[PDB]
Design a protein around this ligand. Structure first.
Ligand SMILES: C[As](C)(=O)[O-]
Ligand SMILES: [Cl-]
Ligand code: NA
Ligand code: NA
Ligand code: NA
Length: 327
DNA sequence: CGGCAGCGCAC
DNA sequence: GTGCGG
DNA sequence: GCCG
């Protein structure tokens, strides 16, 4: 759906990113929601009244929208800190957010070279830095597919009945992907256990995993690995690879969560809430039990969901294909 | 105004 | 406990 | 930033 408000959304995106790299996460979020509404409007917004009719756009946002529409410029951009470009440069490093970016800037650092030379780095950030270029580029989905295949092959060597699926933008059908999330489980509900570790050993021993960002993360019965891989062959770049092993009873919700997008997941939690339910990568549950003070005193009951559609059904929603989950 | 999810990790 | 990314 |  062509954007009939590009000259607007463009300027709005610049201001958004600026708030984002400076810590104003919520304000940046608000902008993002309005920016999406605009991109997909059935016509170029021509009035402040029209703008306000679109959910996600309030008085403040309409003000700016109409200013750009009529004047062609956004005065606020003219007051955006000189630091923004550098804060964005530094935050492009995996492991460094706004606080770290700000710290570096205040220490006089300006280039990725200053960072490499005089900045204190965490293990993750150091890895993020030497793979700056590689990590900044989105890979063709074909490469994501080879990466998924590499993991699945090494995994089925331990148990042929294991189920492996690449999620993220890749599962949403995007031509290119920023990383790869391989979700693994087993239909028998139990044989996924004792797979995670030896799967990582195997992949390391075959030279596929080049660096670890988080070797192991335990979230309930989910085991997650955040790392870096590089397919065999010359000319291959290093890529962000995540591996998640979950028990079959949480497969659908894990699938839903890791497929995203982040905006989709957020809209689904909001909906679940209105129905008195909660949604996580673990399950769809009835809302938690809380005392008079309004505080969790007892967990909700998990509502079984064998497949993704079971999740939509219980939320009273029509199923949406992965391809239609950008928002 | 408070909520916009909750999480586990490195540090 | 904070920063960060999923 | 927006929403209720
Ligand atoms: C427009 As209102 C009720 O969010 O202040
Ligand atoms: Cl499913
Ligand atoms: Na970053
Ligand atoms: Na506020
Ligand atoms: Na977060």
């Amino acid at each position: 759906a062509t954007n009939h408000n590009l000259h607007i959304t463009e300027k709005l995106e610049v201001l958004a990113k600026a708030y984002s790299v400076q810590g104003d996460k919520w304000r940046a979020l608000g902008y993002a929601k309005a920016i999406n509404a605009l991109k997909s409007f059935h016509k170029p917004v021509t009035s402040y009244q029209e703008a306000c009719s679109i959910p996600g756009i309030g008085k403040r946002m309409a003000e700016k929208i109409i200013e750009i529409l009529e004047s062609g410029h956004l005065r606020k951009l003219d007051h955006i800190s000189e630091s923004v470009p550098v804060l964005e440069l530094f935050s492009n490093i995996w492991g460094a957010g706004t606080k770290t970016a700000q710290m570096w800037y205040q220490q006089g650092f300006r280039s990725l070279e200053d960072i490499r030379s005089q900045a204190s780095l965490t293990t993750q950030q150091a890895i993020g830095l030497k793979h700056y270029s590689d990590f900044l580029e989105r890979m063709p989905r074909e490469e994501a597919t080879e990466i998924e295949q590499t993991v699945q092959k090494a995994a089925q060597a331990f148990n042929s009945g294991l189920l492996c699926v690449a999620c993220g933008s890749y599962r949403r059908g995007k031509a290119t992907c920023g990383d790869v999330d391989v979700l693994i489980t087993h239909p028998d509900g139990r044989s996924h256990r004792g797979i995670f570790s030896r799967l990582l050993d195997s992949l390391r021993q075959e030279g596929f995993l080049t660096d670890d960002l988080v070797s192991q993360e335990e979230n309930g019965q989910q085991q997650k690995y955040l790392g870096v891989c590089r397919l065999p062959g010359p000319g291959r770049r290093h890529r962000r690879l995540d591996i998640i092993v979950v028990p079959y009873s949480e497969f659908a919700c894990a699938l839903l969560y890791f497929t995203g997008s982040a905006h989709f997941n957020r809209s689904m939690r909001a909906l679940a809430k209105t129905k008195g339910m909660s949604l996580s990568e673990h399950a769809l549950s009835t809302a938690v039990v809380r005392n008079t003070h309004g505080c969790k005193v007892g967990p909700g009951r998990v509502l079984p969901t064998p497949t993704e559609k079971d999740v939509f059904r219980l939320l009273g929603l029509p199923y949406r294909e992965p391809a239609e989950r950008d928002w």
